[PDB]
Amino acid sequence: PAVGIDLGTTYSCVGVFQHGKVEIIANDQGNRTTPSYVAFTDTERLIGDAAKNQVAMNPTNTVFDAKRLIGRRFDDAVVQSDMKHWPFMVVNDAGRPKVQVEYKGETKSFYPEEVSSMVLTKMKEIAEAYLGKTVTNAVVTVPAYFNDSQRQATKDAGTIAGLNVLRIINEPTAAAIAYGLDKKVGAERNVLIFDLGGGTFDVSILTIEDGIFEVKSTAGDTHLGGEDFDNRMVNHFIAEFKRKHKKDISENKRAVRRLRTACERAKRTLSSSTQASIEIDSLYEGIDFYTSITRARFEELNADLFRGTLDPVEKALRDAKLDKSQIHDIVLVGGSTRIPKIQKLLQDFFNGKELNKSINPDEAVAYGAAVQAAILS
Amino acid sequence: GNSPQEEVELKKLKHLEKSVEKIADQLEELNKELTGIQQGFLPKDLQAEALCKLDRRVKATIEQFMKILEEIDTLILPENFKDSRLKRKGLVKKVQAFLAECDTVEQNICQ
Ligand SMILES: Nc1ncnc2c1nc(NCc1ccc(Cl)c(Cl)c1)n2[C@@H]1O[C@H](CO)[C@@H](O)[C@H]1O
Numbered sequence: 058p059a060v061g062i063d064l065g066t067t068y069s070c071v072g073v074f075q076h077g078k079v080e081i082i083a084n085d086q087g088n089r090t091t092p093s094y095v096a097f098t099d100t101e102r103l104i105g106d107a108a109k110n111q112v113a114m115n116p117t118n119t120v121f122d123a124k125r126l127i128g129r130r131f132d133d134a135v136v137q138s139d140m141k142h143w144p145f146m147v148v149n150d151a152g153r154p155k156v157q158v159e160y161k162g163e164t165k166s167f168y169p170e171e172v173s174s175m176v177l178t179k180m181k182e183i184a185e186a187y188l189g190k191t192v193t194n195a196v197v198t199v200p201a202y203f204n205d206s207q208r209q210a211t212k213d214a215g216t217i218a219g220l221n222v223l224r225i226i227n228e229p230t231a232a233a234i235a236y237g238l239d240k241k242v243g244a245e246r247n248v249l250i251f252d253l254g255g256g257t258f259d260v261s262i263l264t265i266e267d268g269i270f271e272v273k274s275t276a277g278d279t280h281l282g283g284e285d286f287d288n289r290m291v292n293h294f295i296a297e298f299k300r301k302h303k304k305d306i307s308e309n310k311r312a313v314r315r316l317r318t319a320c321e322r323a324k325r326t327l328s329s330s331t332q333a334s335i336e337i338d339s340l341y342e343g344i345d346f347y348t349s350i351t352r353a354r355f356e357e358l359n360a361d362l363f364r365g366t367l368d369p370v371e372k373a374l375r376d377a378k379l380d381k382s383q384i385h386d387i388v389l390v391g392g393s394t395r396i397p398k399i400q401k402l403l404q405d406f407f408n409g410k411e412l413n414k415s416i417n418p419d420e421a422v423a424y425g426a427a428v429q430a431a432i433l434s
Numbered sequence: 435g436n437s438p439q440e441e442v443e444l445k446k447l448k449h450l451e452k453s454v455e456k457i458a459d460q461l462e463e464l465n466k467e468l469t470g471i472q473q474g475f476l477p478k479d480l481q482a483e484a485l486c487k488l489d490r491r492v493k494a495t496i497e498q499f500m501k502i503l504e505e506i507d508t509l510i511l512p513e514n515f516k517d518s519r520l521k522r523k524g525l526v527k528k529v530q531a532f533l534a535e536c537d538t539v540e541q542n543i544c545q
């Protein structure tokens with residue numbers, strides 16, 4: 058057995074190509090993705106869902122977003138600017154970052170690939186629970202814009218975890234492989250991969266001719282995702298509470314959290330029907346918040362954000378010296394790409410060109426990495 | 435006009451009411467240990483460590499209550515589902531009162 062692992066910033070996914078078909082493995086809790094979270098307590102280490110569930114009770118010794126620190130030096134613009142927003146401690150070990158935590162009372166410290174090996178041990182254990190075999194061979198994916206140190210740091214993380222890293226494959230190369238784009242014939246084909254997740258937005262241009270891939274260009278927005286769309290709804294409904302009850306809910310953490318959770322869920326509902334209802338009883342000062350939002354209202358709240366997803370697209374094409382007319386395939390990955398308006402904008406950019414979106418966009422990178430680990434295996 | 439579908443909702447709410455009862459028992463357990471630990475037994479540095487262990491567990495209780503709320507907040511009950519709507523709201527206010535109990539504890543120990 059050989060597995061493909063998407064090692065995500067927020068969540069990870071493991072596939073195995075078996076019986077002519079990729080099976081995206083469900084974890085011990087029944088979920089097809091696993092949060093890339095690790096928590097240290099008085100008594101034990103928690104990885105995945107167990108580590109995410111308890112991030113409110115222990116935010117200090119709960120580590121995440123380690124993929125933003127892996128392979129980087131300590132004064133990377135990026136390590137510096139995300140350190141500002143992480144409850145866990147990033148220390149400087151002679152210019153390399155290490156996460157410091159409290160674990161059974163002893164203060165412990167860990168390089169990001171020790172934290173990332175933890176998640177890879179999780180994903181590996183996960184697949185072995187489904188298969189009832191030992192699992193050691195894997196393909197692990199990285200972002201196309203990853204450098205040598207970042208590629209090697211990830212490979213290491215796998216090796217520390219007991220895996221045999223058959224290869225490190227870029228995420229868009231993984232997605233493209235999922236859609237049998239490497240199987241097409243003859244003439245060279247340009248491929249735009251549109252990766253919009255919960256928190257980031259990555260654009261890639263790749264070329265494929267005869268099953269041979271090259272990265273052309275890389276763009277994106279490091280802090281645009283579904284979380285920004287949830288906030289636009291939160292603002293909308295806070296202003297609406299204020300209009301109907303003349304109450305300001307926004308300094309109530311638990312009311313805003315309740316609202317925001319109903320927002321995120323209603324948003325998903327809006328990718329598949331045209332109106333979402335919400336009932337939150339006793340939201341603030343005992344007052345029931347019953348409301349409803351249409352897909353057009355949700356779209357309008359996010360209008361600038363949806364269309365601005367096109368400036369990394371145009372900008373990736375600039376960098377690749379390609380006319381928007383010379384992209385032969387468009388592929389959608391990351392969960393926020395279910396939003397119809399976004400699928401629509403994009404089609405209407407590529408003068409009405411079709412899109413590859415039939416494989417669950419949360420699952421497509423691990424799918425492709427599965428398909429490729431079986432071939433390399 | 436009692437309908438078969440309302441029974442579905444009343445069953446969810448009953449399942450949620452029994453979880454709520456588990457966390458309320460945890461909250462009772464915490465208050466009991468609080469009372470006993472503040473009751474002098476340990477040197478004050480060691481009490482502090484004990485009280486911070488409880489604090490973290492009150493935090494988990496708060497969290498567990500929030501997760502129940504979040505799931506209650508997924509229900510859509512027609513106006514004619516009067517029995518369900520009353521149960522949903524009874525339950526929300528129960529949790530909310532329990533949440534005040536937690537804050538009261540958490541607010542005092544381990545800062
Ligand atoms: N149908 C959808 N419409 C709009 N956005 C969706 C979306 N699905 C997701 N993500 C995946 C998802 C599926 C099921 C669940 Cl219960 C969850 Cl929490 C997330 N997202 C967003 O993708 C990001 C990664 O999860 C998140 O922003 C999520 O809200």
Ligand SMILES: [Cl-]
Pocket residue numbers: 068090392419
């Ligand atoms: Cl997900």
